[PDB]
Design a binder for this molecule. Structure first.
Ligand code: NA
Lengths: 142, 142
């Protein structure tokens, strides 16, 4: 097995329409607290939480973080993003990255982008017609 | 044929990965000014523009607005949202809805929700792995 810097154990809860992604660290999972992926997309806001690891979580795969760290610090130069944290994420940066190289704001920007993007990637392509737009619009309002 | 109040003529530009939705009024189309739908979702910002109707736009379906008007009114009354307008949208509210009943803000909130939701609905489900999350992460940093 080759040398690796800090990895991310990417996992998901299967919500049928989409997969809700998280990063496993030890016995906990960092994740966006969203119930609905299109809700996050429409509101422009996403908050991290931390929950207990359970057997409902499925490992998607163990990925290198190196690429993302280099790419992130290249591009996101003290920029704003849509992510924040709840009360349970005091050690999120150190926990995920194993270092204080990244600030909390950077850590959650990078990881938030990963989790929301993965969620979005996993969404089932749905026909758009008068019926389905009503269905999803109705869901967006509730 | 049947009594209708103001209808929406929904249309799209087919962008392969997603369909980019618009509302046609006469010879113009109101649409989100974005060429990357996951980027819109990640940034929490979407801005309307108006372009000239072209033969590239595919008519999806003519849908009733009534349901959406009543639902929006009763649900997200004066809630802030992610939508704004560019210089070309001065008459967007009147053009789309026929009357001054909705403020510019309620109108773009309603129509925005519809267009972004439809756009997201249409996105091709993509496997999530080290390769693809890098690809989509990479796009999200541009
Ligand atoms: Na999709």
């Amino acid at each position: 097995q080759q040398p690796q810097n800090r990895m991310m154990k990417l996992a998901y809860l299967d919500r049928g329409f989409y997969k809700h992604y998280g990063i496993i660290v030890g016995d906990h999972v960092y994740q966006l607290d969203s119930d609905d992926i299109f809700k996050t997309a429409l509101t422009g806001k996403a908050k991290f939480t931390k929950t207990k690891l359970t057997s409902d979580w499925v490992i998607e795969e163990e990925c290198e973080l190196d690429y993302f760290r280099i790419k992130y610090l290249e591009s996101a130069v003290d920029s704003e993003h849509i992510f924040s944290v709840d009360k349970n994420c005091e050690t999120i940066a150190k926990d995920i990255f194993g270092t204080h190289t990244l600030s909390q704001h950077q850590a959650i920007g990078l990881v938030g982008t990963i989790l929301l993007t993965a969620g979005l990637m996993s969404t089932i392509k749905t026909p758009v017609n008068a019926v389905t737009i009503k269905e999803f619009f109705n869901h967006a309002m509730d």
